[PDB]
Amino acid sequence: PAWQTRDHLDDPVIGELRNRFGPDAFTVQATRTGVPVVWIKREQLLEVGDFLKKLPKPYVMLFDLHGMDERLRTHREGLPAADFSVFYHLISIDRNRDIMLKVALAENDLHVPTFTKLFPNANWYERETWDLFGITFDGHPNLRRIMMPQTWKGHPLRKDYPARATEFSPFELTKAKQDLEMEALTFKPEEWGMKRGTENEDFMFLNLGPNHPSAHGAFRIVLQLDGEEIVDCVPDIGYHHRGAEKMGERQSWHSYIPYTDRIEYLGGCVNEMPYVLAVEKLAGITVPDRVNVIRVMLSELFRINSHLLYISTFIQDVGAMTPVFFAFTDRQKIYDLVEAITGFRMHPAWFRIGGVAHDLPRGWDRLLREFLDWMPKRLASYEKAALQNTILKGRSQGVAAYGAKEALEWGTTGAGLRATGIDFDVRKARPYSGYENFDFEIPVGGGVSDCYTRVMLKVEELRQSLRILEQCLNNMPEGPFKADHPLTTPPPKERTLQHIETLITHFLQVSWGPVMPANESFQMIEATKGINSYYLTSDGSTMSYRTRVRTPSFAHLQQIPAAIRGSLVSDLIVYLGSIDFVMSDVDR
Amino acid sequence: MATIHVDGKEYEVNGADNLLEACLSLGLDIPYFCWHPALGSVGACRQCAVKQYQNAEDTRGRLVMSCMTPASDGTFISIDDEEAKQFRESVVEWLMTNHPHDCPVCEEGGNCHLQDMTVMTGHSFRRYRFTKRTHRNQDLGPFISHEMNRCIACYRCVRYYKDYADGTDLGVYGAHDNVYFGRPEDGTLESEFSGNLVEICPTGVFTDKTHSERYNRKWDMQFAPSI
Amino acid sequence: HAFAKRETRMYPEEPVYLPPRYRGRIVLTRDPDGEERCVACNLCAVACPVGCISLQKAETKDGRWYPEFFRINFSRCIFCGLCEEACPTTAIQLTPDFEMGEYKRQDLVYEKEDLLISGPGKYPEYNFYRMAGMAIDGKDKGEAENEAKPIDVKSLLP
Amino acid sequence: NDMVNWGRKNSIWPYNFGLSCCYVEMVTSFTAVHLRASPRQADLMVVAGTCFTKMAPVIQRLYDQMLEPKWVISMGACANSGGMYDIYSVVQGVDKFIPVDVYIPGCPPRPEAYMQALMLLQESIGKEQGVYRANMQSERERKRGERIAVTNLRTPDEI
Ligand code: SF4
Ligand code: SF4
Ligand code: SF4
Ligand code: SF4
Ligand code: SF4
Ligand code: FES
């Protein structure tokens, strides 16, 4: 099965590292992540990573870097004695494989050498590890707090830190006056990054925080200006931090599902798919085929809606917005179908562990068929309106372009990375949710990623998604909407209303929570923006022990300073609009 | 004192103990109803079944009851053997054939050992389609309410009340599937230790009447250690 | 004038179309016999992720469980619908009605008289007590679905 | 005469402060009902979205900038209270630090709810905060006999 606990010791990378270093040091954990998890003492981490970086098929992209507390795990059979841990998820595209590296730390000596030299995108990741935990990374260039304000005492992801606001003092405005004094005295100490330029007439400091529309959330990007050039741009993020990861620790597996919908406001059921897939990987549940096709239908509908919003906003900011406002009416039709299936326009919270909340209502096929026959003529009107236009096309060529290597080092996935010559989708490389029974193509941009190429690729992907949605309408099979397994949460409701054992299972599942045995799962999907993943660790209880949400927008927003260096403020704003970043995703 | 082999692994246990309290001492979850640490093992519920092999090379053994088998040195058992798991699920199902549809209106809901063992075995699908047996209740005082429909015939109440507590006014009546646990006639339970039945009974037959005036579920309770 | 003709000015429509499964206002429904359907099982309160439901069980002399008080804090409610699917009696349901707005937050907390409606809502026929073993007026022991008559231990038949 | 009161009911200037989420429905409403909205010119601020501890001074400066007659509409559960995010990093409602006049529950509310918010706000603006000994009547109490008289609803197996 695809859920069984494997060691992955046979994997070639494990044997190459065993040959290179011989025996000892490496303890191969047993998990349901699908990838090989290896423990590597902190004094060899930089050596180990370097070996993997230059291996004859290298791990070019650091997918994720974060930490785990690990202090309260009672079931710790086989692991070394750790009070804290830091995990590094790496991916080799040429091998289409992954590797996870875990460095164990003790509570008195939370110190590890910085990993940013190998992979630059790790810099913010290590900063987050300094912010949310108390690990100090010696050798880090700018190790400051990236989420909480600079006077915030406490490391919020430690388990000795109370999670809920109720345990702290309420908003009595004792600290509001101090924040007011700080904001009124807005001066630059030159500690906000390298800030090599001095604060004088030579260099001008401008917050440049876009609160205008199409900004994709309110954020600040302190900018040093010289000759109207971007000398150094430093984002000030964390304003939209909702503590989703910490929230995952105090909620049951079933009642957390609503929280997934709000990592990305436009994603909806796309955000729910990786969570339910990871929880079912911990449960060992194989769903029926109808569940797979239903999930594919809802995810391609939400993907179509998000892509249409990205196209419309792009044509509005750098082009003529008169015709593309008709897409707003079209988006309403996609919404009337979602609330026909799920119930509510946004944040459906409709996916469940083992299936979906209800069956499809009997008039779904006629509405979907009317939308699928009506849409292609409009889609071709947008294709002519966007492929053939000249004014924005001339404007949108060579505007902060990057190549395959630049995207790889910066962890950038999605339409950004597909705009280069690397043919890498996860729906084909690692099929999930029954994508391997569908026929679709991956468009590609060639070798230059710019603003025109990304939108043309998004239109081609939207056409392939519409082909998937017609295949979902014509090949939806028959049978149940929920798996038959004691951990399917909740049970079918008609069975609950008549049968005592199903009633008892429903009783304990919705009240105490389902008991998932202690193990680790991990799922990644192609999201509306980039690759989104969920790394869940259970300690055997009815709540998550650790929830890690990898959002690509964090990496996409981290990438801007490497590419925008040597451009104007207008090119900056155009690039910010072009890049698929939403503040809710960056700050989770 | 003794060494036992469970599902291939090896453990150190007390020889005088039986296999259920040995395996529960190691943190291995075996379902049970009729065994109690204070009361001892009688072997009634047949819920604690494990597969026992004669040695390490015997692949097909027999289903025994871990509460009734001593944990001697050299014991080879399998809790997770497929036939043992099927049998324990079948026992839960046979207990579920006559259980009333009462969990929303049961005071044991959220604190019921039968709910826990039912989830632990993983029995969630009903096949029994016939009629259910019902019983009338008795009045057992101002302290204890009685709902005999919920009884699973685990015999913990009579073993606690007569043997342990030396009470005289609680017994078992009838035969086959019509066994009735209670008093010969309505009237307050005379024993000074009658209220421990609320913990001793694994279902909601005997429930606290003082708590059912202002009832709330266990997850909504706030607890502290007191004297 | 042709451009204004094809882009006709939008006119708002007083009727609004909602699907049956729309997750708006939270109501408590009644049995087809006319009694309140809620048995104060406290599953909706615990299954809510935000904790917006408070209630207390009461019991009639007849023996019917019913809520002494039922309190929903609609300022915090997100209309996730986990309460509706948690309920094993279909007492609490979500109706297509979003018409809410208030000057004071203290008036957004709804009591049982603001939630208990005069009929059965989405499921006109389901009655939970007909299934339940517990005995109420009109339902002695053996008057439930798929339940045999009580046989006393003193019966002459072996 | 009350001509001054008529002036404010007829015309209002909205300052949209919708945040990351919950603003797509507000935009859906605004593009149907209505570059005019400008800072330090509006008298109505529709706070939507989750109010965070970090960015709360921004909302307090925008609240301070507007003129003496200040109206505030909180929309969504995330703005009325902390909503679902009862967490260290979210302040439990925008009403903690700025006075609020109208509360619109939902997550996100509907454009029709925005329409009913303007109707309840012109109703408050036409009775002079607008209490006036007439606002004790509440929407919980005004339509109570309307809501209780509902008996039948469509079964959810249909569209
Ligand atoms: S006594 Fe236990 S099994 Fe029986 S109805 Fe109550 S909670 Fe369910
Ligand atoms: S009344 Fe309780 S203790 Fe006695 S047999 Fe029945 S379930 Fe067991
Ligand atoms: S789950 Fe339904 S019946 Fe039970 S207390 Fe809640 S609202 Fe009442
Ligand atoms: S709809 Fe959601 S937030 Fe509202 S009471 Fe039900 S579970 Fe709680
Ligand atoms: S009210 Fe709903 S849509 Fe608005 S911010 Fe809160 S969760 Fe998001
Ligand atoms: S509990 Fe061991 S046989 Fe009954």
Q: Tell me the CA distances in angstroms from B102 to A452, A499, B45, B203, C88, one per residue in order.
A: 64, 11, 22, 11, 11
Q: Do A125 and A109 contact (CB within 8 A), yes or no? A: no
Assess whether the C-beta atom of C39 lies below 6 angstroms from ligand 3. Answer: yes
Q: What number of other Cβ atoms are within 10 A of residue A151's Cβ?
A: 10
For ligand 4, is residue C82 a contact (CB within 6 Å)? yes
Contacts of residue B140, Cβ cutoff 8 Å, sequence gap at least 6? B146, B182, B183, B186, B187, B188, B189, B194, B206
Q: To which residue do tokens 């009658």 refer?
A: B194
- First-to-last CA distance in chain C? 96
Q: How far apart are CA B52 and CA D65, in angstroms?
A: 80
Q: Which residues pair with B182 in a beta bridge?
A: B171
Residues A253 and A388 in one domain: yes
Inside any domain, residue C120: yes
Is A544 in contact with A529 (CB distance < 8 Å)? no
Residues lining ligand 5, Cβ inside 6 A = A 262; D 21-22, 49-50, 76-78, 83, 107-108
A263 and A379 inside one domain: yes
Contacts of residue B220 in chain A, CB cutoff 8 Å? none
Task: Give this entry's resolution in angstroms.
Answer: 3.3
CB contact under 8 A, B101 and C89: no
Contact (CB<8Å) A508/B116: yes
The answer to whether the Cα torsion of D81, D85, D88, D89 is positive or negative is negative
Distance C140 CA to ligand 1 centre (A): 19
Apex A459 CA angle, A456 and A463, nearest 5: 140
The whole-angstrom separation of Cα A51 and Cα A28 is 18
Q: Which domain holds residue C88?
A: 1-131
Count of domains forming chain A: 2
Residue minimizing CA distance to atom 5 of ligand 1: B103
Cβ neighbours of residue A68 under 8 Å, at least 6 residues apart?
A84, A85, A86, A87, A537, A546
Cα distances (angstroms) measured from residue B9 to each of A223, B26, B27:
63, 12, 13
What single-letter DSSP state applies at residue C116? Answer: B
Q: In what order do the strands lie in the sheet with B9-13?
A: B9-13, B2-6, B75-78, B49-53, B62-65
Classified as helix, coil or strand, A369 is helix
Looking at 3.40.50.1820, 3.40.50.12280, 1.20.200.10, 3.30.470.10, the CATH number of the domain D1-149 comes to: 3.40.50.12280
- Closest CA relative to residue D43, chosen from D68, D6, D18: D68
Distance from CA of A518 to the nearest CA of B (A): 14
**Domain stop point among A138, A155, A181:** A138
Residue nearest to atom 2 of ligand 6 (CA): B67
Say if C155 falls within a structural domain. Answer: no
D-chain residue closest to A262, CA distance: D21
Number of domains into which chain C is organized: 1
| B47, B118, B164, B203, best to mutate for ligand 2 pocket (most atoms within 8 Å of CB) | B203
Nearest residue to D21 via CA among A360, A216, B50: A216
Cβ–ligand 3 contact at C43 (below 6 Å): yes
Q: Which of D106, D112, D159 is the closest to C16 by Cβ?
A: D112
Ligand 5 geometric centre to CA of A244 (Å):
14
Is the preceding peptide bond at A552 cis, omega within 30 degrees of 0? Answer: no
Tokens of C9: 């000015």
The Cβ of residue C21 has, within 10 Å, a number of other Cβ atoms equal to 25
Answer whether A430's CB lies under 8 Å from A424's CB. no
Nearest Cα neighbor of D39 from D21, D11, D58, D20 is D58
Residue A46's domain comprises: 12-138
- Report whether A105 contacts A79 (CB < 8 A): no
* Interface A-B: count of C-beta contacts within 8 A: 54
Looking at the structure, do residues A325 and A439 belong to the same domain, yes or no? yes
- Is the domain of A127 the same as that of A270? no
The Cα–Cα gap between B183 and B172 comes to 8
Q: Do chains B and D touch (3 or more CB pairs under 8 A)?
A: no
Asked if residue A7 belongs to a domain, the reply is: no
Within a domain: A195? no
Annotated binding-site residue? C38: yes
CA distance D20 to D54: 15
In a domain, A156, yes or no: no
Cα angle D74, A344, A435 (rounded to 5 degrees) comes to 130
The SS3 of residue C59 is strand
Residue A229, in any domain of the structure: no
Domain end call among A138, A173, A198: A138
Tell me: do A253 and A118 sit in the same domain.
no
Domain boundary among A120, A138, A156: A138
Residue C5 within a domain: yes
Q: What are phi and psi of C8, to 5 degrees?
A: -70, 140
Q: Does a structural domain hold residue C1?
A: yes
Kindly determine whether residue B175 and residue C132, on different chains, have CB atoms separated by under 8 Å: no
Q: Which atom of ligand 6 is nearest to the CA of B44?
A: 4
**Which chains border C (3 or more CB–CB pairs < 8 Å)?**
A, B, D
Element (H, E) at A242: none
- What's the residue count for chain B? 227
DSSP states along A172-214: -STTHHHHHHHHHS----S-SS---S-SSSSSEEE-----STT
Distance CA C14, CA C29 (A): 27
Give the amino acid at B226: S
Kindly state whether residues A120 and A259 are assigned to the same domain: no
Residue A99 belongs to a domain with what CATH number? 3.30.460.80
Cα–Cα distance for residue pair A310/A307, rounded to 1 Å: 5
Map residue A347 onto helix, strand or coil. Answer: coil
CA D35 to chain centre: 21
Minimum distance, in Å, between the CA of residue B146 and any CA atom of chain C: 11
Residue ranges of E strands in chain C: 26-28, 53-59, 65-73, 92-94, 109-110
Other Cβ atoms less than 10 A from the Cβ of A366: the count is 10
Of A108, A104, A111, A151, the C-alpha closest to A135 is A111
Identify the CATH number of the domain in which residue C71 sits: 3.30.70.3270
Our CA dihedral for C69, C101, C85, A340, rounded to 10 degrees, sits at: 160
Burial grade of A201 (CB within 10 A; 0-12, 13-18, 19 or more): exposed
For residue A224, what are the contacts with CB-CB under 8 A and spacing of at least 6? A195, A197, A203, A204, A205, A230, A231, A232, A233
Distance from CA of B119 to the nearest CA of A (A): 6
Shortest Cα distance, chain B CAs vs residue C67, angstroms:
11
Instruction: Mark whether B and A touch (3+ CB pairs within 8 Å).
Output: yes
What's the CA gap between A105 and B38, in Å, rounded? Answer: 45
